[PDB]
Amino acid sequence: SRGEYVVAKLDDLINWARRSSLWPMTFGLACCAVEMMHMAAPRYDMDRFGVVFRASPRQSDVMIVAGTLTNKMAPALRKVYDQMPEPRYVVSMGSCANGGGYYHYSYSVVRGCDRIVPVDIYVPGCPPTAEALLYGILQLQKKIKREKRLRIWYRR
Amino acid sequence: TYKYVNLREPSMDMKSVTDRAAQTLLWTELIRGLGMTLSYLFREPATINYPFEKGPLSPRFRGEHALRRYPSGEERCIACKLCEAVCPAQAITIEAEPRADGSRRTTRYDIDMTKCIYCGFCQEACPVDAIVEGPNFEFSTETHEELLYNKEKLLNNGDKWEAEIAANIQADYLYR
Amino acid sequence: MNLMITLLTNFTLATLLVTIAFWLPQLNVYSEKTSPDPMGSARLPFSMKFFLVAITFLLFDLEIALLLPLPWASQTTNLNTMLTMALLLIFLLAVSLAYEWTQKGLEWTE
Amino acid sequence: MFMINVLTLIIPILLAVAFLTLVERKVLGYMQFRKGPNVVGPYGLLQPIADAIKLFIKEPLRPATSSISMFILAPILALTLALTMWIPLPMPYPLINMNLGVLFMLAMSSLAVYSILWSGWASNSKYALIGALRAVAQTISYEVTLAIILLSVLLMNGSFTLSTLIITQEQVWLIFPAWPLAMMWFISTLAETNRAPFDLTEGEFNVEYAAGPFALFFMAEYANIIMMNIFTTTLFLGAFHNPYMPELYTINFTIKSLLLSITFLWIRASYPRFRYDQLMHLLWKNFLPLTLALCMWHVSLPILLSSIPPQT
Amino acid sequence: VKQDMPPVGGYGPIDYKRNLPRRGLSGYSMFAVGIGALLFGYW
Ligand SMILES: CCCCCCCCCCCCCCCCCC(=O)OC[C@H](COP(=O)([O-])OCC[N+](C)(C)C)OC(=O)CCCCCCCCCCCCCCCCC
Ligand SMILES: CCCCCCCCCCCCCCCCCC(=O)OC[C@H](COP(=O)(O)OCCN)OC(=O)CCCCCCCCCCCCCCCCC
Ligand SMILES: CCCCCCCCCCCCCCCCCC(=O)OC[C@H](COP(=O)(O)OCCN)OC(=O)CCCCCCCCCCCCCCCCC
Ligand SMILES: CCCCCCCCCCCCCCCCCC(=O)OC[C@H](COP(=O)(O)OCCN)OC(=O)CCCCCCCCCCCCCCCCC
Ligand SMILES: CCCCCCCCCCC1=C(C)C(=O)C(OC)=C(OC)C1=O
Ligand code: SF4
Ligand code: SF4
Ligand code: SF4
Numbered sequence: 001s002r003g004e005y006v007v008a009k010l011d012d013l014i015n016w017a018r019r020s021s022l023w024p025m026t027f028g029l030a031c032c033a034v035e036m037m038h039m040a041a042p043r044y045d046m047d048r049f050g051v052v053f054r055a056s057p058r059q060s061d062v063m064i065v066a067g068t069l070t071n072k073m074a075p076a077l078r079k080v081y082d083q084m085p086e087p088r089y090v091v092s093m094g095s096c097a098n099g100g101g102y103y104h105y106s107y108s109v110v111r112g113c114d115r116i117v118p119v120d121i122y123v124p125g126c127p128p129t130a131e132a133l134l135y136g137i138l139q140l141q142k143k144i145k146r147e148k149r150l151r152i153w154y155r156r
Numbered sequence: 157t158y159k160y161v162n163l164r165e166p167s168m169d170m171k172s173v174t175d176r177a178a179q180t181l182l183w184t185e186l187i188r189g190l191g192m193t194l195s196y197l198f199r200e201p202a203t204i205n206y207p208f209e210k211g212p213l214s215p216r217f218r219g220e221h222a223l224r225r226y227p228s229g230e231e232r233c234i235a236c237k238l239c240e241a242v243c244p245a246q247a248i249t250i251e252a253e254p255r256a257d258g259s260r261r262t263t264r265y266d267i268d269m270t271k272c273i274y275c276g277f278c279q280e281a282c283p284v285d286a287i288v289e290g291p292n293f294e295f296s297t298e299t300h301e302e303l304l305y306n307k308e309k310l311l312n313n314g315d316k317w318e319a320e321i322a323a324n325i326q327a328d329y330l331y332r
Numbered sequence: 333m334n335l336m337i338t339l340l341t342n343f344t345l346a347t348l349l350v351t352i353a354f355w356l357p358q359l360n361v362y363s364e365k366t367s368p369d370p371m372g373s374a375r376l377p378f379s380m381k382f383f384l385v386a387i388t389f390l391l392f393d394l395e396i397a398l399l400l401p402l403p404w405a406s407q408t409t410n411l412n413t414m415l416t417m418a419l420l421l422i423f424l425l426a427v428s429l430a431y432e433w434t435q436k437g438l439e440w441t442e
Numbered sequence: 443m444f445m446i447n448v449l450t451l452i453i454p455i456l457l458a459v460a461f462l463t464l465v466e467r468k469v470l471g472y473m474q475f476r477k478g479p480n481v482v483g484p485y486g487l488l489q490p491i492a493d494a495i496k497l498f499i500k501e502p503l504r505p506a507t508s509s510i511s512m513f514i515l516a517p518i519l520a521l522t523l524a525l526t527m528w529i530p531l532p533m534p535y536p537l538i539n540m541n542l543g544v545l546f547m548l549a550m551s552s553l554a555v556y557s558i559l560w561s562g563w564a565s566n567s568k569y570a571l572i573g574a575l576r577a578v579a580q581t582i583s584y585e586v587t588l589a590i591i592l593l594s595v596l597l598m599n600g601s602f603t604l605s606t607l608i609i610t611q612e613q614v615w616l617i618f619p620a621w622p623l624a625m626m627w628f629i630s631t632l633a634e635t636n637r638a639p640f641d642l643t644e645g646e647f648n649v650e651y652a653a654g655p656f657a658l659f660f661m662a663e664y665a666n667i668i669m670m671n672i673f674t675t676t677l678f679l680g681a682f683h684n685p686y687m688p689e690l691y692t693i694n695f696t697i698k699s700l701l702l703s704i705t706f707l708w709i710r711a712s713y714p715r716f717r718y719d720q721l722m723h724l725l726w727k728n729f730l731p732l733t734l735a736l737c738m739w740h741v742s743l744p745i746l747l748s749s750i751p752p753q754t
Numbered sequence: 755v756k757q758d759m760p761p762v763g764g765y766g767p768i769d770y771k772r773n774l775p776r777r778g779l780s781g782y783s784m785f786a787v788g789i790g791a792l793l794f795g796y797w
Contacts, residue, residue, distance in 0.1 A: 044204070085500050101245070403596045433727070
């Protein structure tokens with residue numbers, strides 16, 4: 001129909017603006033912060049994708065959980081997650097954020113950050129390289145590109 | 157065998173005093189900093205065009221795991237569980253039995269890719285080059301359990317990447 | 333009249349942009365947020381130094397207000413008196429600054 | 443017809459502020475041995491459009507405001523004062539040609555701290571209020587040397603008329619008789635707009651605003667940056683004006699103001715931040731004594747040389 | 755044997771000291787250029 005075409009083009013517009021202007025808040029927990037700092041370094045350069053370097057946690061669009069989540073900091077992670085405006089996304093970077101990793105059987109480690117926050121992209125590695133993290137960010141952009149918020153709103 | 161950083165007593169003749177005061181009043185080192193930043197403005201940047209251009213890797217690179225095969229179709233894993241005894245993360249779960257022709261073969265070969273520390277002790281502990289840690293690093297998933305590989309996923313990674321894995325092992329095996 | 337139209341246009345554009353910023357994303361039916369700082373709940377401690385730099389601003393801005401007719405005052409016929417009083421005003425501003433210095437008024441915001 | 447002239451002033455201000463963000467990210471990219479944005483548009487040209495559409499559909503941050511009214515008025519006042527600083531600017535003819543355009547700009551820039559102060563008090567955070575008081579004290583501090591340097595330079599102009607300041611500089615740029623006033627002016631206007639190395643709002647006040655109103659504060663701040671570079675260009679680097687071809691002056695002051703805005707972008711990618719007391723020390727103990735001494739010199743100097751400029 | 759080794763004469767010399775090349779005029783010359791710019795502006 002006509003309105004279906006309108007909500008299709010508006011979904012394309014707002015998904016374009018949301019994937020082409022991702023603002024990340026990176027939790028620099030552990031060694032994966034070093035490789036995020038390489039994904040911001042000149043070779044890979046997140047900023048040329050519109051992915052800025054270190055937005056504040058209240059204007060950021062995606063939370064990159066880069067490192068080991070312990071039991072002592074998991075409520076702070078959930079607090080920063082709850083304080084993000086929607087649409088908010090979570091990239092889990094590295095094995096400790098994904099599933100506990102090398103500290104999986106530890107007494108003081110949350111076995112994956114997905115016990116705490118809903119995770120969109122799981123980026124595997126110890127650490128995953130800056131190229132692999134940039135792959136995960138572009139896969140997040142492709143996930144945003146196929147969102148159907150207004151088409152489902154029009155069909156409800 | 158040692159040196160003194162910042163132990164320079166400055167000169168007090170009118171030449172050096174007026175040099176330091178001209179540096180204070182005319183901002184010489186600030187223009188030196190602006191000159192260095194302006195020098196990098198006209199350099200060619202170091203940015204590669206990902207995904208079209210790729211970062212350089214070596215044949216030793218430790219990425220996604222793969223169970224290999226001999227050059228007849230027979231799989232190399234003879235169910236010996238050295239890769240899970242050596243595994244620092246206990247990411248490898250192995251269960252075995254004799255199959256229908258009497259070969260010592262696995263039925264369960266799981267790797268939890270979210271426990272794995274990607275250190276490659278499994279490929280260097282493997283006596284028959286069955287488990288390798290191949291060159292794929294672009295395998296991010298959208299769900300946690302898609303990073304929980306069974307034997308089918310790992311043998312499919314072997315069949316998927318063997319044309320590359322065999323050449324990397326061919327380039328590196330005389331260092332091993 | 334052109335200036336009043338210009339001021340009204342700029343205020344109307346600013347109010348239109350502020351209304352779009354405060355009401356266009358309100359139409360998002362996202363979610364109700366449950367339970368929406370370095371100091372927790374302590375009172376704001378009064379800083380004497382912030383008030384001191386504000387009053388020093390106010391007094392030197394008054395001395396600036398005395399200095400502001402100088403591009404018109406250079407046109408006078410009584411130039412010796414004008415030059416003496418101009419140098420005396422800038423000198424009294426400098427004496428205010430020197431007294432603010434030497435009695436430790438410019439400290440920890442120097 | 444005058445309304446068309448007001449629109450052709452205020453809409454290209456917004457467009458140049460929109461693309462100044464792209465120029466900042468690109469110039470800071472290449473000065474950091476990387477690139478700036480080049481994926482979202484052809485050569486990155488659609489990055490500010492994408493970012494504006496992103497911010498205007500982001501969730502409102504929904505703060506508990508102390509005063510609702512001042513929380514609304516601080517972006518309104520910031521944008522209104524950011525737009526009204528352009529109307530006496532002679533390029534080569536201003537929108538509002540007035541006899542006291544310099545003093546008008548100094549007044550409307552003195553009024554700009556109420557937006558910072560009202561945004562700081564209208565937030566319930568005491569930390570945001572402390573940051574707002576620091577930013578207001580910083581800005582009102584450097585307004586002192588703005589006023590005195592500006593007075594000392596206009597002692598060579600004869601009036602507060604901005605259009606007379608082009609006639610003043612037809613034989614020489616006014617930076618040649620007044621380069622120490624120029625360099626202290628340039629650092630003081632760098633400290634007016636909370637711009638690096640004087641950006642203690644980013645170093646560890648409007649953090650409770652949603653993405654829309656924070657974008658409005660951001661664009662008012664960049665309108666102030668472009669405007670103060672244009673005002674510094676007219677004030678110290680006055681271009682040639684042929685009255686039969688005004689576009690010569692317009693192209694010339696545009697090139698000079700673009701170079702000066704890039705010079706702001708080039709300062710912010712070169713130096714670390716001051717500590718708060720260090721730029722207070724820079725104002726009250728370095729810039730203000732030389733500013734007063736040069737004010738005495740530029741009072742007494744047209745009298746001792748017989749170079750008093752005309753009143754009209 | 756075949757092994758990663760330095761070449762037969764070794765490598766060349768590698769610089770490792772501070773090299774800040776001391777550019778610019780003297781302070782006398784910098785105040786001279788500044789005062790000359792002031793005098794040209796005043797004239
Ligand atoms: C308009 C176009 C641009 C104009 C030029 C500006 C472009 C260059 C910008 C460079 C980057 C700057 C980044 C921010 C830097 C802030 C810090 C800084 O510089 O602080 C200023 C510093 C501060 O001092 P300081 O901190 O460096 O030194 C230590 C100071 N104490 C001891 C107090 C701690 O210097 C000044 O304040 C100088 C201001 C300008 C001086 C002008 C003097 C002119 C010459 C007068 C005559 C001299 C001879 C004697 C008389 C002769 C008579 C015949
Ligand atoms: C009645 C029906 C119509 C309903 C209303 C809609 C009116 C028109 C709205 C704009 C156009 C809508 C379509 C949006 C794009 C859809 C196609 C798309 O996504 O193309 C992708 C392409 C880039 O491909 P990408 O996926 O980014 O690849 C990465 C690099 N290989 O993307 C590109 O090449 C760039 C896409 C740019 C999108 C358009 C430009 C921005 C929007 C301008 C208008 C709105 C804003 C106006 C000004 C705001 C303030 C400045
Ligand atoms: C004073 C001057 C100020 C200038 C400000 C702006 C500067 C930049 C101007 C724009 C420069 C070019 C921009 C091109 C954007 C990318 C367009 C594009 O390629 O979109 C492709 C997309 C998908 O198309 P599709 O059919 O799927 O393609 C498959 C092909 N087999 O299709 C789409 O996305 C749909 C088409 C979208 C078109 C959007 C065009 C950009 C609009 C920007 C706003 C400003 C317009 C210019 C204003 C000044 C000039 C009047
Ligand atoms: C909290 C409330 C909302 C806050 C946001 C909005 C308000 C703040 C931002 C706007 C500030 C407005 C400033 C208005 C007056 C500025 C001074 C002025 O007009 O100077 C220009 C000019 C003097 O130059 P001259 O050349 O001498 O005059 C022409 C004759 N030759 O003089 C003229 O040309 C005179 C022209 C006729 C008289 C104009 C009177 C204007 C209307 C009254 C003031 C409007 C603002 C009131 C509220 C201010 C709040 C700060
Ligand atoms: C409708 C006219 C434009 C409205 C304002 C939105 C676009 C300009 C500001 C956006 C912005 C950009 C581009 C930006 O790059 C940025 O990061 C440095 C911001 O946050 C501090 C911004 O707010
Ligand atoms: S997944 Fe491994 S390398 Fe990455 S942050 Fe964790 S411990 Fe460090
Ligand atoms: S992969 Fe290698 S080390 Fe592991 S059980 Fe099989 S044969 Fe043994
Ligand atoms: S790379 Fe290391 S942690 Fe991963 S499966 Fe092999 S031995 Fe285990």
